Design an enzyme around this catalytic site. Structure first.
Site, PDB file in Angstrom:
ATOM      1  N   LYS A  65       2.486 -15.671   2.485  1.00 17.62           N
ATOM      2  CA  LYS A  65       2.714 -16.536   1.352  1.00 17.62           C
ATOM      3  C   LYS A  65       4.224 -16.934   1.386  1.00 17.62           C
ATOM      4  O   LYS A  65       4.941 -16.868   0.379  1.00 17.62           O
ATOM      5  CB  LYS A  65       2.274 -15.851   0.020  1.00 17.62           C
ATOM      6  CG  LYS A  65       2.035 -16.801  -1.146  1.00 17.62           C
ATOM      7  CD  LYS A  65       0.888 -17.813  -0.980  1.00 17.62           C
ATOM      8  CE  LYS A  65       1.017 -18.809  -2.140  1.00 17.62           C
ATOM      9  NZ  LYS A  65      -0.047 -19.836  -2.231  1.00 17.62           N
ATOM     10  N   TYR A 102       0.828  -1.233   0.000  1.00 14.74           N
ATOM     11  CA  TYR A 102       0.000   0.000   0.000  1.00 14.74           C
ATOM     12  C   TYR A 102       0.854   1.272   0.000  1.00 14.74           C
ATOM     13  O   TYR A 102       0.485   2.260  -0.610  1.00 14.74           O
ATOM     14  CB  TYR A 102      -0.959   0.007   1.220  1.00 14.74           C
ATOM     15  CG  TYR A 102      -2.261  -0.767   1.030  1.00 14.74           C
ATOM     16  CD1 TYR A 102      -2.262  -2.064   0.485  1.00 14.74           C
ATOM     17  CD2 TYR A 102      -3.473  -0.221   1.400  1.00 14.74           C
ATOM     18  CE1 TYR A 102      -3.426  -2.789   0.346  1.00 14.74           C
ATOM     19  CE2 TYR A 102      -4.637  -0.928   1.246  1.00 14.74           C
ATOM     20  CZ  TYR A 102      -4.607  -2.197   0.709  1.00 14.74           C
ATOM     21  OH  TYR A 102      -5.757  -2.902   0.515  1.00 14.74           O
ATOM     22  N   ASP A 158      -3.958 -18.490   0.699  1.00 14.32           N
ATOM     23  CA  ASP A 158      -4.980 -19.185  -0.060  1.00 14.32           C
ATOM     24  C   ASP A 158      -5.749 -20.201   0.824  1.00 14.32           C
ATOM     25  O   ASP A 158      -6.978 -20.207   0.837  1.00 14.32           O
ATOM     26  CB  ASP A 158      -4.417 -19.809  -1.371  1.00 14.32           C
ATOM     27  CG  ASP A 158      -3.285 -20.822  -1.134  1.00 14.32           C
ATOM     28  OD1 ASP A 158      -2.525 -20.637  -0.161  1.00 14.32           O
ATOM     29  OD2 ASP A 158      -3.115 -21.788  -1.956  1.00 14.32           O
ATOM     30  N   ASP A 210      -7.002  -6.894   4.045  1.00  7.86           N
ATOM     31  CA  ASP A 210      -8.108  -6.231   3.330  1.00  7.86           C
ATOM     32  C   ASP A 210      -9.020  -7.282   2.681  1.00  7.86           C
ATOM     33  O   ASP A 210     -10.244  -7.220   2.809  1.00  7.86           O
ATOM     34  CB  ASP A 210      -7.525  -5.300   2.247  1.00  7.86           C
ATOM     35  CG  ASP A 210      -8.580  -4.722   1.358  1.00  7.86           C
ATOM     36  OD1 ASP A 210      -9.486  -4.095   1.899  1.00  7.86           O
ATOM     37  OD2 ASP A 210      -8.490  -4.884   0.130  1.00  7.86           O
ATOM     38  N   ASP A 269     -12.996  -8.466   4.110  1.00  7.88           N
ATOM     39  CA  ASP A 269     -14.248  -8.493   3.294  1.00  7.88           C
ATOM     40  C   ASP A 269     -14.813  -9.908   3.192  1.00  7.88           C
ATOM     41  O   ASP A 269     -16.009 -10.104   3.268  1.00  7.88           O
ATOM     42  CB  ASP A 269     -14.063  -7.936   1.855  1.00  7.88           C
ATOM     43  CG  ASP A 269     -14.492  -6.510   1.741  1.00  7.88           C
ATOM     44  OD1 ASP A 269     -14.285  -5.734   2.696  1.00  7.88           O
ATOM     45  OD2 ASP A 269     -14.984  -6.145   0.653  1.00  7.88           O
TER      46      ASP A 269
HETATM   47  N1  LIG Z   1       0.236 -27.337  -6.366  1.00  7.83           N
HETATM   48  C1  LIG Z   1       0.953 -27.581  -5.252  1.00  7.83           C
HETATM   49  O1  LIG Z   1       1.982 -28.250  -5.342  1.00  7.83           O
HETATM   50  C2  LIG Z   1       0.540 -27.016  -3.936  1.00  7.83           C
HETATM   51  C3  LIG Z   1      -0.611 -26.195  -3.810  1.00  7.83           C
HETATM   52  C4  LIG Z   1      -0.927 -25.689  -2.536  1.00  7.83           C
HETATM   53  C5  LIG Z   1      -0.113 -26.007  -1.422  1.00  7.83           C
HETATM   54  N2  LIG Z   1       0.976 -26.809  -1.580  1.00  7.83           N
HETATM   55  C6  LIG Z   1       1.812 -27.229  -0.421  1.00  7.83           C
HETATM   56  O2  LIG Z   1       0.968 -28.095   0.369  1.00  7.83           O
HETATM   57  C7  LIG Z   1       1.433 -28.157   1.776  1.00  7.83           C
HETATM   58  C8  LIG Z   1       0.245 -27.882   2.702  1.00  7.83           C
HETATM   59  O3  LIG Z   1      -0.305 -26.623   2.253  1.00  7.83           O
HETATM   60  P1  LIG Z   1      -1.781 -26.243   2.800  1.00  7.83           P
HETATM   61  O4  LIG Z   1      -2.322 -26.897   4.083  1.00  7.83           O
HETATM   62  O5  LIG Z   1      -1.613 -24.683   3.011  1.00  7.83           O
HETATM   63  O6  LIG Z   1      -2.911 -26.419   1.695  1.00  7.83           O
HETATM   64  P2  LIG Z   1      -3.512 -27.840   1.271  1.00  7.83           P
HETATM   65  O7  LIG Z   1      -4.295 -27.555   0.003  1.00  7.83           O
HETATM   66  O8  LIG Z   1      -2.372 -28.798   1.104  1.00  7.83           O
HETATM   67  O9  LIG Z   1      -4.480 -28.377   2.392  1.00  7.83           O
HETATM   68  C9  LIG Z   1      -5.447 -27.385   2.765  1.00  7.83           C
HETATM   69  C10 LIG Z   1      -6.475 -28.083   3.639  1.00  7.83           C
HETATM   70  O10 LIG Z   1      -7.396 -28.828   2.838  1.00  7.83           O
HETATM   71  C11 LIG Z   1      -7.125 -30.249   2.990  1.00  7.83           C
HETATM   72  N3  LIG Z   1      -7.005 -30.902   1.683  1.00  7.83           N
HETATM   73  C12 LIG Z   1      -6.221 -30.539   0.626  1.00  7.83           C
HETATM   74  N4  LIG Z   1      -6.433 -31.405  -0.344  1.00  7.83           N
HETATM   75  C13 LIG Z   1      -7.363 -32.349  -0.001  1.00  7.83           C
HETATM   76  C14 LIG Z   1      -7.983 -33.496  -0.612  1.00  7.83           C
HETATM   77  N5  LIG Z   1      -7.719 -33.935  -1.926  1.00  7.83           N
HETATM   78  N6  LIG Z   1      -8.881 -34.182   0.115  1.00  7.83           N
HETATM   79  C15 LIG Z   1      -9.194 -33.827   1.359  1.00  7.83           C
HETATM   80  N7  LIG Z   1      -8.643 -32.789   1.951  1.00  7.83           N
HETATM   81  C16 LIG Z   1      -7.722 -32.028   1.324  1.00  7.83           C
HETATM   82  C17 LIG Z   1      -5.859 -30.412   3.887  1.00  7.83           C
HETATM   83  O11 LIG Z   1      -6.085 -31.488   4.799  1.00  7.83           O
HETATM   84  C18 LIG Z   1      -5.798 -29.072   4.643  1.00  7.83           C
HETATM   85  O12 LIG Z   1      -6.734 -29.118   5.699  1.00  7.83           O
HETATM   86  C19 LIG Z   1       2.466 -27.037   1.892  1.00  7.83           C
HETATM   87  O13 LIG Z   1       3.791 -27.591   1.777  1.00  7.83           O
HETATM   88  C20 LIG Z   1       2.137 -26.164   0.642  1.00  7.83           C
HETATM   89  O14 LIG Z   1       3.225 -25.339   0.199  1.00  7.83           O
HETATM   90  C21 LIG Z   1       1.296 -27.303  -2.782  1.00  7.83           C
HETATM   91  C1  LIG Z   2     -10.327   2.199   0.100  1.00  4.12           C
HETATM   92  C2  LIG Z   2      -9.070   1.253   0.329  1.00  4.12           C
HETATM   93  C3  LIG Z   2      -7.817   2.126   0.471  1.00  4.12           C
HETATM   94  C4  LIG Z   2      -9.237   0.430   1.657  1.00  4.12           C
HETATM   95  C5  LIG Z   2      -8.024  -0.459   1.965  1.00  4.12           C
HETATM   96  O1  LIG Z   2      -7.716  -1.370   1.066  1.00  4.12           O
HETATM   97  O2  LIG Z   2      -7.459  -0.348   3.029  1.00  4.12           O
HETATM   98  C6  LIG Z   2     -10.589  -0.279   1.830  1.00  4.12           C
HETATM   99  O3  LIG Z   2     -10.728  -1.351   0.859  1.00  4.12           O
HETATM  100  C7  LIG Z   2     -10.698  -0.899   3.247  1.00  4.12           C
HETATM  101  O4  LIG Z   2     -10.856  -2.222   3.304  1.00  4.12           O
HETATM  102  O5  LIG Z   2     -10.591  -0.170   4.214  1.00  4.12           O
HETATM  103  C1  LIG Z   3       2.397 -23.903  -3.840  1.00  6.58           C
HETATM  104  C2  LIG Z   3       2.222 -22.535  -4.470  1.00  6.58           C
HETATM  105  C3  LIG Z   3       3.542 -22.086  -5.175  1.00  6.58           C
HETATM  106  C4  LIG Z   3       1.027 -22.477  -5.454  1.00  6.58           C
HETATM  107  C5  LIG Z   3       0.757 -21.028  -5.908  1.00  6.58           C
HETATM  108  O1  LIG Z   3       0.650 -20.050  -4.969  1.00  6.58           O
HETATM  109  O2  LIG Z   3       0.634 -20.850  -7.085  1.00  6.58           O
HETATM  110  C6  LIG Z   3      -0.256 -23.079  -4.886  1.00  6.58           C
HETATM  111  O3  LIG Z   3      -0.671 -22.280  -3.791  1.00  6.58           O
HETATM  112  C7  LIG Z   3      -1.365 -23.096  -5.913  1.00  6.58           C
HETATM  113  O4  LIG Z   3      -2.498 -22.461  -5.580  1.00  6.58           O
HETATM  114  O5  LIG Z   3      -1.163 -23.700  -6.955  1.00  6.58           O
HETATM  115 MN   LIG Z   4      -3.022 -21.888  -3.937  1.00  4.21          MN
HETATM  116 MN   LIG Z   5     -11.374  -3.412   1.883  1.00  6.12          MN
END
Ligand SMILES: NC(=O)c1ccc[n+]([C@@H]2O[C@H](COP(=O)([O-])OP(=O)(O)OC[C@H]3O[C@@H](n4cnc5c(N)ncnc54)[C@H](O)[C@@H]3O)[C@@H](O)[C@H]2O)c1
Ligand SMILES: CC(C)[C@H](C(=O)O)[C@@H](O)C(=O)O
Ligand SMILES: CC(C)[C@H](C(=O)O)[C@@H](O)C(=O)O
Ligand SMILES: [Mn+2]
Ligand SMILES: [Mn+2]
Ligand SMILES: NC(=O)c1ccc[n+]([C@@H]2O[C@H](COP(=O)([O-])OP(=O)(O)OC[C@H]3O[C@@H](n4cnc5c(N)ncnc54)[C@H](O)[C@@H]3O)[C@@H](O)[C@H]2O)c1
Ligand SMILES: [K+]
Lengths: 349, 345
Positions: free
Chosen positions: A187, A141, A219, A243, A247
């Site tokens: 992240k 920001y 995420d 932010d 929301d």
């Molecule tokens: N594309 C990828 O390779 C990828 C994407 C996202 C996260 N990651 C990695 O995964 C590991 C864990 O990350 P995370 O917990 O933040 O996200 P995650 O997506 O791995 O899991 C998120 C939540 O949802 C559940 N979940 C995910 N997939 C599922 C499935 N097929 N069935 C049932 N439950 C499921 C998990 O138990 C956890 O509670 C980290 O090392 C992260 O960096 C890898």
């Molecule tokens: C208007 C914008 C600058 C603001 C922010 O992102 O902080 C708003 O979205 C909020 O959530 O207060």
């Molecule tokens: C593991 C990570 C690098 C990846 C991303 O942020 O693109 C994952 O979160 C996804 O959503 O595929």
């Molecule tokens: Mn993701």
């Molecule tokens: Mn906002």
């Protein structure tokens, strides 16, 4: 005069919901002998049209000299395309930066018995009581370099150690007064700034061994916040992620018109809805004033230590929501009528 | 039909094997001439080659027609520095193949409304396609770095990066319901203002397609309150990442969401979900995302549209019949997979 307040009504629904909060404050002032005094000052669009800038000098002075600020939302199509340095939103950023209000507190609570008002099934919404502690004066920001040419644009997400430490501190102090659990959101698997954020919050947490600390990637946190929200207490995060997640957290109680906020740090504390100026409904007398009212309740508590008065407002709002819901929650109570319902309950208590 | 299989870590090999069994049954019934090789990727590759995307794996990907990918990462390598961690191999795979267009559909299949945590009337007819820019923005922008006093990353986009992902979203909308919402934070960030303006310009080339803008914080709320009003949603790398995890609450679980990554090199098909280390080893991971990702491979890399649809129909029936534990059921990975196959056959 012993409760001195700067009121900054803003644009769109801003003045509508802010007036509602004022009628609640006035009713409390008279009933309780609070000695409330407030001055109203131009801010946002209204200030651009009258002074050429969103945060003019008399408004800055009003802010500086008040004990608290009750703020309305700014922005709208009317001001589309302004030089960035005078946009209504940049005035909001300047407000925050000039008072160094680095801690933004955004609570999302689903009131017992109002679980049905959520788009989600009742079991997900039941029991939800979360406090987002968002870092407000740093990150992408305010970071530099930032700009734009014909071929590209760039913004910098950046944090120093003391910025992370001071927001992390607020989140641990808050958790210690709640249910002693913090989730820190980043992240770190993609970004140096997340790795840095995580490591710094880990260090700060070593100072608070009575508080449990967990990390989540942004995420996954978004998904968890809609599947398992009851399992969270304090959620601490940077400027942009806070932010978005705040929301998103509105879907828990069921509307963005419900969510209040407080911005705290070095200067005058600011109390304001999460929601924006809502130009699609401005002027129709339907805007849910709950966020603004609950923001006045946060002002009572945090700026003036009036915890019990704040709780009375909250309870009056929860009863009014159950009795005469506004249209964003499937009911028919316009702004004025909902506000009267709140006052009735206040007076009864 | 030549495929590189990259099973990954945690639940990655488990759900990837399930998709393979579906692909094999399809190969036999349809005579696809499937040929696949398995390559090490992620943590499994760090442990065997000291790096997450090794040379024989890169060569396998280059030479295949499509990649079926499993998720990577887990506590085992949490102590490595990021730059050599399993997730950086994923980013390298994407970057080396210039797969700039990430397609993440979130649909409530007709009949599965009950599987969503959304009230049924909110979830009826929901069919959203997120088009996420995969090779630019803060994920890859310079300068990036870290000292003891501070850390920084750059959210950067050039005009051609935005134009090409915008094009993909407009083309996709033209074959769907002709609506695009483009998501940014133009009210705070120069890069959002620039994204918005460039998407507007590309859209002047598609007058049959309606174009709307939302700021990312309002978009997150709208995607849960009123999902039925979106068709295609186009956005940058980090906003796409967040919105698409959030989108899982529409069909009901993260374990349902598939993805395709398309661009210059070998196309990649893979679940949205990660390696789920909190359930790895238990035989319970929902393999739907992996199976539906195989379906997307069939359609997008091989033009086998009707086969894709058949896979998707069998998944939907199995979900209704024997739901996995993440959707309130009791069917573990093998049992759920068997249900899919029975409906295929
Ligand atoms: N594309 C990828 O390779 C990828 C994407 C996202 C996260 N990651 C990695 O995964 C590991 C864990 O990350 P995370 O917990 O933040 O996200 P995650 O997506 O791995 O899991 C998120 C939540 O949802 C559940 N979940 C995910 N997939 C599922 C499935 N097929 N069935 C049932 N439950 C499921 C998990 O138990 C956890 O509670 C980290 O090392 C992260 O960096 C890898
Ligand atoms: C208007 C914008 C600058 C603001 C922010 O992102 O902080 C708003 O979205 C909020 O959530 O207060
Ligand atoms: C593991 C990570 C690098 C990846 C991303 O942020 O693109 C994952 O979160 C996804 O959503 O595929
Ligand atoms: Mn993701
Ligand atoms: Mn906002
Ligand atoms: N603190 C602030 O000043 C603030 C915060 C957010 C957005 N904004 C500005 O507000 C304008 C609108 O932006 P937006 O649409 O993305 O965000 P928004 O928060 O104003 O509205 C988002 C959605 O929620 C609805 N809504 C919001 N508040 C409501 C209320 N009290 N009652 C009933 N419904 C309500 C709106 O109609 C819209 O459908 C923009 O100019 C933006 O920059 C300002
Ligand atoms: K004070």
């Amino acid at each position: 005069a012993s409760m001195k307040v700067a009121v900054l009504p803003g644009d769109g629904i801003g003045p509508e919901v802010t007036e509602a909060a004022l009628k609640v404050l006035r009713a409390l002032d008279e009933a309780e002998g609070l000695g409330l005094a407030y001055e109203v000052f131009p801010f946002g669009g209204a200030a651009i049209d009258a002074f050429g800038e969103p945060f003019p000098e008399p408004t800055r002075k009003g802010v500086e000299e008040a004990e608290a600020v009750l703020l309305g939302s700014v922005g709208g199509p009317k001001w589309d395309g302004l030089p960035r340095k005078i946009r209504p939103e940049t005035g909001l950023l300047s407000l925050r930066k000039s008072q160094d209000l680095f801690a933004n507190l955004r609570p999302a609570k689903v009131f017992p018995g109002l679980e049905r008002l959520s788009p989600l099934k009742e079991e997900i919404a039941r029991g939800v009581d979360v406090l987002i502690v968002r870092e407000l004066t740093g990150g992408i920001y305010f970071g530099e370099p930032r700009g734009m040419s014909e071929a590209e644009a760039w913004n910098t997400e950046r944090y120093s150690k003391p910025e992370v430490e001071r927001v992390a501190r607020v989140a641990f102090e808050a958790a210690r007064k709640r249910r002693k659990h913090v989730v820190s959101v980043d992240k770190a698997n993609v970004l140096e700034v997340g790795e840095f954020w995580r490591k710094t919050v880990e260090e700060v947490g070593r100072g608070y061994p009575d508080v449990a600390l967990e990390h989540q990637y942004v995420d996954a946190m978004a998904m968890h916040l809609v599947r398992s929200p009851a399992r969270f207490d304090v959620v601490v995060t940077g400027n942009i992620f806070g932010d978005i997640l705040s929301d998103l957290a509105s879907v828990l109680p069921g509307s963005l018109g419900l969510l209040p906020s407080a911005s705290l740090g070095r200067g005058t504390p600011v109390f304001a809805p999460v929601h924006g100026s809502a130009p699609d409904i401005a002027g129709k007398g339907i805007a849910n004033p709950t966020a603004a009212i609950l923001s006045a309740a946060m002002m009572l508590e945090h700026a003036f230590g009036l915890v019990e008065l704040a709780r009375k407002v909250e309870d009056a709002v929860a009863k009014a929501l159950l009795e005469t819901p506004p249209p964003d929650l499937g009911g028919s109570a316009g702004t004025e009528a909902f506000t009267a319902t709140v006052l009735r309950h206040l007076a009864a208590a």
